[PDB]
């Protein structure tokens, strides 16, 4: 779909999920936008190391 979905300035309306605490089961969908703690610390608020 390089004729329908690509833009000369880049199209960024399409996303994937890069992080998750667990792999999802067959035909599941995850709408969550919770922040992913990759470190051993917890974190609170919108972003962190």
């Amino acid at each position: 779909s390089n004729n329908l979905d690509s833009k000369v300035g880049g199209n960024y309306n399409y996303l994937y999920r890069l992080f998750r605490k667990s792999n999802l089961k067959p035909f599941e969908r995850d709408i969550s936008t919770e922040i992913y703690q990759a470190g051993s610390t917890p974190c609170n608020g919108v972003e962190g190391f």
Partner: antibody
Amino acid sequence: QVQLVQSGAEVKKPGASVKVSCKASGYTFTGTYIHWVRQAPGQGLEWMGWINPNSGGTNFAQIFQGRVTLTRDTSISTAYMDLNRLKSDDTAVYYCARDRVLYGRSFGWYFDVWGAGTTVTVSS
Amino acid sequence: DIQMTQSPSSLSASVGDRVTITCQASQDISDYLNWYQQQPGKAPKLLIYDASNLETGVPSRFSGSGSGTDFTFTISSLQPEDIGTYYCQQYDNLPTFGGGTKLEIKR
């Protein structure tokens, strides 16, 4: 049989507010964007507003920011624009129109069908 | 902002005569331009999208061409139903509209 209907004529003072409705029918309202446009008498088309009937995500032309509110009623298949602190040149024909369901590009806005038009009048 | 300039204020032409209407942009829109008509006292109607593709159920004697900065809308013959006002709209950043070329019959 896609039919797009709007509220009738409105008579308003300068500095006041006006709410114009956009009743969808013949298709699933949550399937595509609704765009708002307005044509002043003897003038060119003027876009200002777009609102995703599924998400409620909303965006504007810069000169209408803080003046126009766009909203939607998925239960009643109806979009609305609500316009505040009405200027004398807010006197225009206003339209809602629909973004493309079929064989376009994924960004493109378009106006495949337009409502009956609402003739809002602002005067002292 | 992205300015749509459009050069004819109004056009006078006869039945069977060719019409070309020009729209142009401040920078490369690449392909991201749509064309419409409005008939007198009635709402707008889409004719060409993606600077080239003809709308469903509209007669083949409408045409569209051009890319990058500049875009041309074309009619082979302005039969009296085509009379009205013609608008281009870009989509590279927000919808923005051209001037509004009127059609007039050459009598």
